[PDB]
Design a protein around this ligand. Structure first.
Ligand SMILES: CC[C@H](C)[C@H]1O[C@]2(CC[C@@H]1C)C[C@@H]1C[C@@H](C/C=C(\C)[C@@H](O[C@H]3C[C@H](OC)[C@@H](O[C@H]4C[C@H](OC)[C@@H](O)[C@H](C)O4)[C@H](C)O3)[C@@H](C)/C=C/C=C3\CO[C@@H]4[C@H](O)C(C)=C[C@@H](C(=O)O1)[C@]34O)O2
Ligand SMILES: CC[C@H](C)[C@H]1O[C@]2(CC[C@@H]1C)C[C@@H]1C[C@@H](C/C=C(\C)[C@@H](O[C@H]3C[C@H](OC)[C@@H](O[C@H]4C[C@H](OC)[C@@H](O)[C@H](C)O4)[C@H](C)O3)[C@@H](C)/C=C/C=C3\CO[C@@H]4[C@H](O)C(C)=C[C@@H](C(=O)O1)[C@]34O)O2
Ligand SMILES: CC[C@H](C)[C@H]1O[C@]2(CC[C@@H]1C)C[C@@H]1C[C@@H](C/C=C(\C)[C@@H](O[C@H]3C[C@H](OC)[C@@H](O[C@H]4C[C@H](OC)[C@@H](O)[C@H](C)O4)[C@H](C)O3)[C@@H](C)/C=C/C=C3\CO[C@@H]4[C@H](O)C(C)=C[C@@H](C(=O)O1)[C@]34O)O2
Ligand SMILES: C[C@H]1[C@H]2C(=O)N(C)c3ccncc3[C@H]2CN1S(=O)(=O)c1ccc2c(c1)OCO2
Ligand SMILES: C[C@H]1[C@H]2C(=O)N(C)c3ccncc3[C@H]2CN1S(=O)(=O)c1ccc2c(c1)OCO2
Ligand SMILES: C[C@H]1[C@H]2C(=O)N(C)c3ccncc3[C@H]2CN1S(=O)(=O)c1ccc2c(c1)OCO2
Ligand SMILES: C[C@H]1[C@H]2C(=O)N(C)c3ccncc3[C@H]2CN1S(=O)(=O)c1ccc2c(c1)OCO2
Ligand SMILES: C[C@H]1[C@H]2C(=O)N(C)c3ccncc3[C@H]2CN1S(=O)(=O)c1ccc2c(c1)OCO2
Ligand SMILES: *[C@@H]1O[C@H](CO)[C@@H](O)[C@H](O)[C@H]1NC(C)=O
Ligand SMILES: [Cl-]
Ligand SMILES: [Zn+2]
Ligand SMILES: [Zn+2]
Ligand SMILES: [Zn+2]
Ligand SMILES: [Zn+2]
Ligand SMILES: [Zn+2]
Lengths: 343, 338, 338, 343, 338
C-alpha cells in the first residue's frame, strides 16, 4: 500500500523531514534558476496624473529544489495545499516599480503549489499591482506609452539567485481583454534590468507593454468642438460692418470659449513643463479666432469717417478674409495632421 | 457523547483528520454546489467600469470523513472556528477588483454538517467586480454585469463547481437600484478556464441592468429642448436688431456646447459614438443653423432697398415653420430608432 | 481565592469551559438583550445613500457556567482579553456597508460578569449603514434610516435578540447634525429573516431624520427669486432697446438653468420628480415667459405706427402687474402644499 | 566580595515573565484605591482641519504614568530602566481611548513606536505615538472671522472611577513641537484643561479633556473673497459715468456684475458644510449684492423717467446719476465702517 | 557546521541570545550608520503640504554576539525571518504622516552579517513625509523637503544615529519629477530631540526641489497676456460703439478674475501674498484701467461738439501707446525681481 499523504508531507517538508526553508536549493553550489511567467487577468486604471497603471496577474515561478524530489507515488506531479508554502523555501521576488501591491485572500489564499518527481516546483500567486509608468506626453493625444514591470530579488545576489523569463509564452493576456482609452499591442519587449546597489548585484527581469492611445474620443470631445468655434468666428465676416456690438460680441465669445476649451482639456493631465501636441492645436485655433477679432478692429478703424472711399476699403478686408481664413485654416490642418500621422 | 469529545474525534486532535487532503482524494472530483444571496447591489460606476455587491456565498459539498452517528439530529450547527480544522474549496472571484470578509462583531460565517457528511458553508463577502460596459446606446443602454466563481488551485479532476438547481441566486426583498432596474432573469453558464497551469472549474452568473430613462429626460433631454426652442425666438425678432439676434444666436450655441460636454463628465473616455452624442450633435446643428439663418438675413438685406428687405423677411417666415417642423421630424426618427 | 486561580477555574485551563458550546445548549434559546449608545451620528450621504455612526453596542445574556460564589461582589469587571475564552453571540449588522473595531490605545471592549452568570459585553464600533432614501419632497424631505442587529449562524431555536425595555437607544448629550434634526422617537421592531439556510433573529431600530430647511432658503430658493425678480425689470425698459431687453431675458434664462442643474449635483441620479425640480421648472417658466413677452412686444410693434406702438405698450403695463401677481400665487400654492 | 549583578534575561523573567507570577489581567492595588494615571501629550503635528467633515487630525506622543508596586526592583542601582517595548504585552496598562476619535492608528515603522520605562519604586512611564482624527463641531456664525474650539477627550472604556482615574500632569501637560505652524489657523498658546467624567448606564468612567483654541487667519479671505467682491461693486458704479442713451452697455454692465456676484457668493460656500444658519460671509455677499442690484435698478429708473425725449425729463434722469455717483460710494463706505467694526 | 545548527547556536534556542538586550549593553552607545536609496520620489502636494517617497533604508551596526568563526566567508546572507531573533534599532521617521512595509511576494527585507559581528539591515519602505512649504515666490518657488530618522525609545547614551561618510543618499538612475527638479546637493544634519522623556538621536536629510517654470508660462502667464492684449483692441474701436467697447472691457475683467481665482485652486489657503497674486493683481489693473479709459472717453464726449469729440479722441491715441509701454515696463521689473 502507498504512503499516506500526511506521513509523506511530514517526511518531505514537515517535522520528520529535517527540511530547512531558510536554506536555498543547491546552497553551496550554483545560483537557483527561477523561470517566471505572468498571466494578465486585468489591465487598467492607466492614470496620466499619477503616472501609473494597475494590473491583476497570476505570477508563476518555477525552480528546482532537490530536497522535494519524491519516489513514493507514480504521479508526474502533486498538487499540494497552499498552506505548505510556509514550509518550503521560495524566491523573494518583488516588483521594483510597484507603488502598491496586495495578495488575494478571498475565499482562501489565491495560491497554487505543485511539485514534480524531480523536485521542480510550480508556484502561482494572484496579485494586484499598481506600477509606476513615467509618460512622455509630447504627442498627446496621439501619444504612445511604454509601461514596464520589473521582477527583482530583494535579498539574494546574482551568485545565489537568478531570474529568467520562460522561452515559450512568458506573458499571456486574458481573451477579450480590452482597454477603453488604449490599445495594448501584441508585442511585449523582454529584457534584463540587473541592478547594482551598494549592497551588491541583484537579478532583475523586465517586461515592457506598448500602449497606443485611441484617437476617437479626442476627435469627438476636443478637435471637432474646436473646429465649431473657429468656424463660428468666420460668420462675423458675413455680418454688416455697422453692427459693432454684434461683431465684437461674436469675436469675444469665440476667444473666451476657446480659452476655457483649451484649459479644460489640460485638467486631466499632469502639470508638465514641455509643449504637447494638443497645446499647438489650441494655440493655433486661438490665433485664428483672435485674428478674426483683430480683423474687425481694422474694419472698424479704417471706416471711421463715413466717406465711400474708406467704407469700400473696409469692405474689401471682409471679402478677402471670407476666403483667406478658411483657406489658411485648411492649410494648417494639412500640415498638422500630416506631421502627427507621418511622425 | 459530549460536544467537546465529539469535535475532537471528528476533526480535532484524536480524529486523524487532515484538512490538506480533499474528500474522496483518490477518487472522483469534489462536487461543490454554489448559491448566492444578494444582500446589496450598487456603486455601479461607468467611469471605473465596475460594480459593488454584498452577498452571502453558500457552498455545499460532501466530506465522508465528517459523517456522524452519535446524535439523531439531521444536522449540526458548528461554531465557525471549526472551519480552520476542515477542508474546504478554494473559491475565488475571477473578475474581482476588491473583496473582503466581515468580522464585526464576530466572523460572519456559518458551518453546518449533516449525518451523511454533507457540509453547508456560508460566508458574507463584499466584492467589487469588474463590469466592462458598452455605452453605444447611452443613456438608453442595457448592461450585462457578470460574476465568475473559480478554483485557483484545484484542476477539474479534483474540484468542480456547479450552481444549485433551485434558486441559485436570491435577491433581498425590496432591493432597489436608483439608476438601474435589475432584471429578474439571471443567466447561468460555465466559464471553464484553460491556463498553461491546467484546466480549472469556473461558473458564471450574468445580471442584466437596464438604465432608468427618467433622470435623463429631466436633466439632459428637456433642458436641450429648452435651448433649441430658445434659438427660434430669434425669428420673431426685428431684423434691424443685429446685436439682439446675434447675441441670442451665440448664447444658445455656447450653452449647448457646455450642456453637451457637461453630460460626458460622468463617463469613461471611450472612442466610439454614443446615442447622447447624436442627440447633442443634432441639437447643436439646429441651434447653429438658427445663427447662420441670421447671417443670411443680415447679408441679403445689406442695401435698404425694399426688394431685399422683403426677400430677407421671407427667410424668417419660412424658418419660423421649417425648424420646428424639422426638429419634430428629427425626434420622430430619434426616439423610434432607440 | 486569587483572581488568577479563579479565572483558571471559571473559564481557563482547569475549568473545562468550551466557548464553542452555547449556554443552555440542550435547552431553550439564549436570550440576548441589546442596547446601544450613539456616540456620534453623521456622514449622511444622499449620493451613496448611507450614513455613519459610532456606537457602544451592549449585549446582555445569561451563561450559567460563569456563575460564581467565591466573592461577595454583585459583579466582577474582567480584563477584556477574557472575551476570547467565553462564548458570545455572533451579532452582525445586516445593512452594514463598512464596520470596524477600535483598538487604540487598547481594545475598546468591556466585560462584566454577575453572581448568577449574567454577562454584560460592551464594544465600541464604527458602522457605515445603508439608508435608502425617498427624495420626492427634497429639500423638505424626511428620511428613515434603519439599523438591523442580526445573528449570522444561530437559528431562532438557539439564539434570540431583544431590545432592552428601558432606554434601548441612548444618544450623547448635545449631539447635533448640521443638515438634519434627529427626532427623539426611535421605532423598534423585529426584522426576523427567513433564508434558505433557516430562520434567524433580527431586531431593528429606525431613526427619523428631518432635513433642515434654512440652508436651502439661503443658497437655493432666495437666489432663484433674485433671478425671477431680475427678469421683471425688462418690463420697465424702453421697447426700442432690443439688445438690452433680449440680453436681459437670455441671461436670466441661462443663469436659471445653471442654478437648476447645479442644485442637482449633490444628489443621486434618481428617475422621479423631486420638489426642487418643480420649483426650478416653474421659476424657469416665469423667466422664459418674460423673454417670450418681449418677442410679442417686438413683433406687434414692427411698423412704427402709433396704433401698434401703444398696443405693444399695453402688454408691458399688464405684464408689470401680472407676473409678480402670478408668481406670488404660485408661492402660495407651492409652500402650502409642502 | 562584590558579585556580578543579575542578568537582564533572568531579571525580566522574575519581574514580569514565567517565574514572576505576574498577572497583567489584575490592576495595581487591585483590592485598594483606584490607579492614578497621569497623562501628558506632545503634539508632533496638527492639521487637516476640515470644516466640511467637521474634524481635525493630530500626531501625538501620548505619555501615561502610573505606579505598579509589582514592578519595583532592587537588583540594580539605576533610578530607572529602559525596557524593550515587547515587554508591554507582559504588564498591566490603562485602557485609554479617545472618546471623540473618528479614526486612530499606531505606528509600526520601522518597529513599534513605543517606549517603556520603569523606576525603582514601581512607577511606569509609557509613551506611544498615535495619529488621531478627532471630531470638532464648529460654529461658523462669524466665518471667516470665526474662532474654533477643538477638543480631545482621554477616557477609560472598561474601568470605573473606583478602579481607574485619569489626571493631567501639573507641569506642561500639553507640549507642542517647536515651529509648528498651521496655514489657515493660529493655535493659541493657552489650552484649557478639564474633566469630562462620563455617566453611562454601565457606570461612571474617568475622562479628562484638553481644548485647543484655533483662530482663523483673515489674510486669505481678504485676497480671495473680500477684495474681489469690492472690485465687482466698484465696477457697477462705472455705469453712472456712462451715457444714458447707451442702453445695451449700461444694462449689460449692470447684469454681468449681478451674475458675477452670485457666482462669487455661491463659490465661497463650496468649501463649507451645509449649515442652516446665517454666516458673516453671507451678510457681506448679501449687501454687496444689494449695492450691485441697486445699480441696475438705478438705470431702470433712469431709462423709465427719460422715455419722452423732452428736456425736462432728460435732465431729471440726469439728476439721478449725479446723486448716485456720490451716494453709493458713500453708502458702501458707511456699510464697511459698520461691518468691520461689528466683527 | 550545518546552517541549521549554526543559526541555533548563534541566535536560536541554544544561543542564549536575547534580542531585548542591545549590543554593548553596559558600555557605550550603539553606533548605527544609515544610508538610503531613493527608488521613487513624487506625489508632491502643495495642498496637503507633503510628499511621497519609496526607499531602501540601510542600517549598519556592530553586535559582538553575532561574530562567527565557523565559516571563512567575509559575510553571510541570512533569511530575513531571522530578523525577529536579533536586536535591531527602533528607527522611526519623525515627520512621517504615513508609512508601510512591502510584503509582496515576501518581506522586502535583507539581513547580512559579517565575521566581526557587523550587521547590514536593509528594508524597503514607502513613506509619506510632511514638507511645510513657503509659497511666497510661487510659481518660481524653491522648496526644502526634509526627512528625519529618529530613535523612539533609546536615549543618546544607548543609541546614536549617523549618516554614512560615502554616498549616504543615492537616487535611482533616470529618476525624474514632472513638476520639480531634484537638486544634486542634499544637506545632512543633526535634528537631536529633547523631550520631557529625554534626549534622542535624530539625523536629517534635506532635499532641494526647484519648481519647473514651463508649465506656468503655457497655462498661466501666456493666457493672462492674451487677455491684457485683448483689452487694448478697445482703443482701435470707434468711440460711438458703446456696447462693443463696454462689453469688451467687461469680459476681459471677468475672464481675468476667473483666471486668477482658478490658478489658486490647486494651492493651500495661505494668508500671505504670493508672486502669482502680484502678477494677476497688476494684470487686473491694466485690464480694469482699459475699461475706466472708456468711462473717461464716453464721459468727456457727452455733447457732440467737435472740441470734446477730438479731446476724447486724444485719450485713445495716448492709451494705444502708453498701456503697451507701461505693461512692458512692468514685465521688465517683474521678471527681473524673481
Ligand atoms: C505671445 C503670447 C500672445 C498672448 C499670443 O497668444 C496667442 C494668440 C495671441 C497672441 C499673439 C494665443 C496663445 C499662443 C500664442 C502663440 C504661442 C505658441 C504657438 C507657443 O508658444 C510660443 C512661445 C513660447 O515662449 C513663451 C515657446 O515656448 C518656449 C518655452 C517652452 O517651455 C515650456 C519650450 O518648450 C520652448 C522650446 O520655448 C513656444 C515654443 O512658442 C505655444 C507653446 C503656446 C501655447 C499656449 C497655450 C495653449 O493653451 C494654453 C491655455 O490653455 C490657454 C487658456 C490659452 C493658450 C494661449 O494663450 O495660446 C495657452 O496658453 O498665440
Ligand atoms: C416640455 C419641455 C419644454 C422645453 C418646456 O420647458 C420648460 C419651459 C419651456 C418649455 C415650455 C422648462 C423646463 C420644465 C418645463 C415644464 C415641465 C414640467 C413643469 C415638468 O415636466 C413635465 C413633463 C414630464 O414628462 C416629460 C413629466 O414627467 C412625468 C412623465 C415622465 O414620462 C413622460 C416620467 O419619466 C416622469 C418620472 O414623470 C412631468 C410630471 O411634467 C417638470 C418635472 C420638469 C422639470 C424640468 C427641469 C427641472 O430642472 C431641470 C434641469 O436642471 C434644467 C437645466 C432645466 C429644467 C427645465 O428645462 O425646465 C429641468 O429640465 O417647462
Ligand atoms: C483696493 C482693491 C480695489 C477693488 C482694486 O482692486 C484691483 C483693481 C481695482 C481696484 C483699484 C484688483 C485687485 C488687486 C488690487 C490691487 C491690490 C494689490 C496690488 C495687492 O493688495 C494690496 C492691498 C493688501 O491689503 C488689502 C496688501 O496686503 C498686505 C496688507 C494686508 O493688511 C492690510 C495684509 O493682510 C496682507 C497679508 O499684506 C497688499 C500688499 O497690497 C495684492 C496683494 C492684491 C491681490 C488681489 C488678488 C489677486 O487675485 C485675487 C482673486 O483671485 C481675484 C478674483 C481678484 C484679485 C483682485 O481683486 O485684484 C485678487 O483679489 O487692484
Ligand atoms: C544557508 C544560507 C545562509 C545561512 O544561514 N548560513 C548559516 C550560511 C552558512 C554558510 N554560507 C552561507 C550561509 C547563508 C547563505 N545560505 S543561502 O544561500 O541558502 C541563503 C538563504 C537565504 C538568503 C540568502 C542566501 O540571501 C538572502 O536570503
Ligand atoms: C493528498 C493531496 C495532495 C498531497 O499532498 N499528496 C501527498 C498527494 C499524494 C498522492 N497523490 C496526490 C497528492 C496531492 C493531491 N491530493 S488532493 O487531491 O487531496 C489535493 C489537496 C489539496 C490541493 C490539491 C489537491 O490541489 C490544490 O490543493
Ligand atoms: C454544541 C454545539 C454544536 C456542536 O458542536 N455539537 C457537537 C453539537 C452536538 C449535539 N447537538 C448540537 C451540537 C451543535 C449545537 N451546539 S450549540 O447550540 O451550542 C451551537 C454552537 C455554535 C453555533 C451554533 C450552535 O449555531 C452556530 O454557531
Ligand atoms: C482582579 C480583577 C478582576 C478579576 O478578574 N477578578 C477575578 C476579580 C475578583 C475580585 N474582585 C474583582 C475582580 C475583577 C477586578 N479586578 S481589577 O480591578 O484588577 C480589574 C481588571 C481588569 C479590568 C477591570 C478591573 O475593569 C476593567 O477591566
Ligand atoms: C538590558 C536593557 C534593559 C533591561 O531590560 N534591564 C533589565 C536593564 C538592566 C540594567 N541596566 C539597564 C537595563 C535596560 C537597558 N538595557 S538596553 O540598553 O539593552 C535597552 C534595551 C531595550 C531598550 C532600551 C535599552 O531602551 C529602549 O528599549
Ligand atoms: C560612529 O562611527 C563613525 C565611523 O563609522 C565615527 O566616525 C563616529 O565617530 C562614531 N560615532 C560615535 C558617537 O562614536
Ligand atoms: Cl454679451
Ligand atoms: Zn516592442
Ligand atoms: Zn439573458
Ligand atoms: Zn415614528
Ligand atoms: Zn482658553
Ligand atoms: Zn543647500
Amino acid at each position: 500500500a502507498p504512503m499516506s499523504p500526511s506521513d509523506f508531507l511530514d517526511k518531505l517538508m514537515g517535522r520528520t523531514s529535517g527540511y530547512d526553508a531558510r536554506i536555498r536549493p543547491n546552497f553551496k553550489g550554483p545560483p537557483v534558476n527561477v523561470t517566471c511567467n505572468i498571466f494578465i487577468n486585468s489591465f487598467g486604471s492607466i492614470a496620466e496624473t499619477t503616472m501609473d497603471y494597475r494590473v491583476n496577474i497570476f505570477l508563476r515561478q518555477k525552480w528546482n529544489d532537490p530536497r522535494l524530489a519524491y519516489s513514493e507515488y507514480p504521479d508526474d506531479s502533486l498538487d499540494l495545499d497552499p498552506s505548505m508554502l510556509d514550509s518550503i523555501w521560495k524566491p523573494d521576488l518583488f516588483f521594483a516599480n510597484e507603488k502598491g501591491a496586495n495578495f488575494h485572500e478571498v475565499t482562501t489564499d489565491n495560491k497554487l503549489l505543485r511539485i514534480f518527481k524531480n523536485g521542480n516546483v510550480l508556484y502561482s500567486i494572484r496579485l494586484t499591482l499598481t506600477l509606476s509608468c513615467p509618460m512622455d506626453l509630447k504627442n498627446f493625444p496621439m501619444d504612445v506609452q511604454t509601461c514596464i514591470m520589473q521582477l527583482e530579488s530583494f535579498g539574494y545576489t546574482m551568485n545565489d539567485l537568478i531570474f529568467e523569463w520562460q522561452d515559450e509564452a512568458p506573458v499571456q493576456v486574458a481573451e477579450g481583454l480590452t482597454l477603453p482609452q488604449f490599445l495594448l499591442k501584441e508585442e511585449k519587449d523582454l529584457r534584463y534590468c540587473t541592478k547594482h546597489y551598494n549592497t551588491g548585484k541583484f537579478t532583475c527581469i523586465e517586461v515592457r507593454f506598448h500602449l497606443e492611445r485611441q484617437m476617437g474620443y479626442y476627435l469627438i470631445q476636443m478637435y471637432i468642438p474646436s473646429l465649431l468655434i473657429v468656424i463660428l468666428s468666420w460668420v462675423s465676416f458675413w455680418i454688416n460692418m455697422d453692427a459693432a456690438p454684434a461683431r465684437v460680441a461674436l469675436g469675444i465669445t469665440t476667444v473666451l470659449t476657446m480659452t476655457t476649451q483649451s484649459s479644460g482639456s489640460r485638467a486631466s493631465l499632469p502639470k508638465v513643463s514641455y509643449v504637447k501636441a494638443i497645446d499647438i492645436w489650441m494655440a493655433v485655433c486661438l490665433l485664428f479666432v483672435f485674428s478674426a477679432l483683430l480683423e474687425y478692429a481694422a474694419v472698424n478703424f479704417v471706416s471711421r469717417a463715413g466717406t465711400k472711399v474708406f467704407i469700400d476699403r473696409a469692405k474689401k478686408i471682409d471679402t478677402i478674409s471670407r476666403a483667406c481664413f478658411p483657406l489658411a485654416f485648411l492649410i494648417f490642418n494639412i500640415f498638422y495632421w500630416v506631421i502627427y500621422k507621418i511622425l
